[PDB]
Structure formats: C-alpha cells, structure tokens
Amino acid sequence: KRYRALLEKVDPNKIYTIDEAAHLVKELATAKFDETVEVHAKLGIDPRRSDQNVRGTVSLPHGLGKQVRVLAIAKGEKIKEAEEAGADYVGGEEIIQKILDGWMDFDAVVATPDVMGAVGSKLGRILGPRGLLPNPKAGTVGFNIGEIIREIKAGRIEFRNDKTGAIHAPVGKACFPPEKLADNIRAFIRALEAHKPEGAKGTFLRSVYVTTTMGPSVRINPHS
Ligand SMILES: [Hg+2]
C-alpha cells in the first residue's frame, strides 16, 4: 500500500480538460525523482491491418531539440559517428562507471545494440525508473546512432501503436509548469489526429489518458 491518498484526488468517472489534468497530474507524481508524464490513447483501428497502423513524429513545443543534452554510449567506429552527429557526451562502456559514481548531467541516453548487455545490467536500476534506459521501441537503441541523435536534436519524438491498439508517448516531467505540460499534451493530440488512417472507420480516439510512471490515470477531453 502506497496509494489510498493518491486515489482520493482523482474522480474516475470524470473527463478532465487538458488544463485541469495538467494541474492535477503534478499532485499524483509525489514520488522520488522527476516522474515522466505520458499521454495514452485507445484508437479505433484494427491493429492487425498494416494499412490502419499509426506511426509518426511530433515536434513538442517544450523540452526537446538543442537544449537536450544527449549521452551516446557506443563501440568501435560508432563512437566517431556519434561525435560527428553532435551528441553532447559520447563514450564507450568506460563511461558507465562515471554514471555509477554520480554523474548524471544528461537528459537522454541513446546506445548501440552491442553495449546494452552491460548498460541494462549495470544501469537498469538507476536509469530504468528515471525513464533514461535506451529501449528499442522508444527508438533510443540502434546501429544508425547518428540518425537517432539528429532526430532528438531536431526536437522530434516518434510514435506508433502497439499490438493492443493502444499508443502513447512521454510529454514532459511532473515538475514542468502546468501550462507547458498542457501545451505538450495538446501538441501530441493534434499530431495523432493528423495521422488518422484513410480507411479507419468510426471514432479514432476512443478514450485518452494522462498518467505518470506509477500513478492513477486521468481521463481527458482531447478537444479541450
Ligand atoms: Hg512506455
């Protein structure tokens, strides 16, 4: 038990406006560190149909682009590729000890498939909860590491539905000022609607939610 007080602040049968949720969500993220805020949606698509799949990018108005300090962990000539692409910090596995000793001045981590065993094994504990672990479908692990770095630097994050017909993406951290959070949430919804597939029939956004790492979900009105 660590949530009776957390359950009293949210009405489960209420559809909140994006601004109310933006303010409310900050009070649900009363946990350690800076909690990642995500928007989740149930889409009106047939997930087994390739012509009804949703994949795209959203340029969020706050938090991304240049200002993001990217740490790239790689091996061989991939370190050179990462340097050429402009990652803020680049290192081989030797840099894991630096993070272990308390170094943490980066906002995002990208890595090549070959350093992941050691990365996930030595840092899954620290980075995992903070939402900083490179992950194949978060698009932060791949051999085309120069491309990954340039995308984030450009301020774009990718999204795609999963096999259950759900989709989601991080839109900020709990500490963000509510108006910035609200701006980012609206930006993701606008991007998502512009990606409604041709033949999708019926309601596209069946229900939309805002949530933190390990908190209750808040249902929101996508058109507020
Ligand atoms: Hg996720």
Side-chain angles (χ1 to χ4, degrees):
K1 208 233 119 271
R2 197 227 188 190
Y3 26 56
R4 184 243 255 187
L6 223 47
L7 261 81
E8 292 165 348
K9 296 159 188 286
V10 179
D11 176 359
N13 299 275
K14 172 170 172 42
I15 308 299
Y16 294 78
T17 62
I18 289 162
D19 287 300
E20 287 180 299
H23 288 93
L24 181 57
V25 103
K26 294 199 48 170
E27 306 161 353
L28 307 177
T30 303
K32 253 45 190 56
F33 57 76
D34 215 6
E35 211 143 359
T36 296
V37 176
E38 310 194 279
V39 178
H40 297 248
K42 276 142 80 132
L43 310 169
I45 64 170
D46 177 343
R48 285 168 196 274
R49 272 184 76 144
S50 302
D51 55 352
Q52 279 192 15
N53 269 251
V54 185
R55 172 95 135 259
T57 61
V58 48
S59 311
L60 293 183
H62 320 273
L64 295 176
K66 293 281 173 279
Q67 57 180 311
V68 181
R69 286 152 286 166
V70 183
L71 158 62
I73 308 176
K75 266 168 44 177
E77 59 90 15
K78 291 293 171 183
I79 285 180
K80 282 293 165 196
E81 179 172 317
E83 296 176 353
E84 186 59 31
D88 298 80
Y89 308 109
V90 185
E93 289 174 31
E94 301 100 321
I95 212 177
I96 296 171
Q97 293 284 110
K98 277 245 284 179
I99 296 169
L100 254 22
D101 298 352
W103 175 57
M104 210 103 185
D105 311 323
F106 43 84
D107 306 299
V109 186
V110 300
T112 50
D114 42 41
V115 293
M116 283 308 290
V119 167
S121 192
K122 311 192 73 175
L123 300 174
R125 249 223 168 195
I126 293 86
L127 301 181
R130 281 178 168 73
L132 297 168
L133 252 205
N135 167 302
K137 85 157 142 187
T140 54
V141 171
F143 284 124
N144 52 323
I145 208 167
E147 298 168 51
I148 299 174
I149 294 157
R150 296 176 162 120
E151 195 76 356
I152 299 172
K153 280 299 179 177
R156 282 191 300 270
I157 56 183
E158 243 262 345
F159 56 80
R160 52 184 203 101
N161 68 271
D162 58 36
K163 63 177 168 178
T164 76
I167 188 169
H168 59 269
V171 296
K173 318 244 56 185
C175 197
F176 271 30
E179 305 83 14
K180 279 194 175 180
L181 259 180
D183 287 348
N184 282 2
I185 292 161
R186 285 207 184 80
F188 176 60
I189 291 165
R190 288 304 299 279
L192 188 57
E193 301 223 272
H195 283 88
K196 171 173 171 168
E198 315 98 280
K201 177 138 169 183
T203 327
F204 186 48
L205 302 177
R206 297 177 58 100
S207 55
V208 183
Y209 310 86
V210 171
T211 201
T212 55
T213 300
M214 197 180 137
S217 322
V218 176
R219 179 146 177 204
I220 60 159
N221 177 358
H223 304 120
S224 58

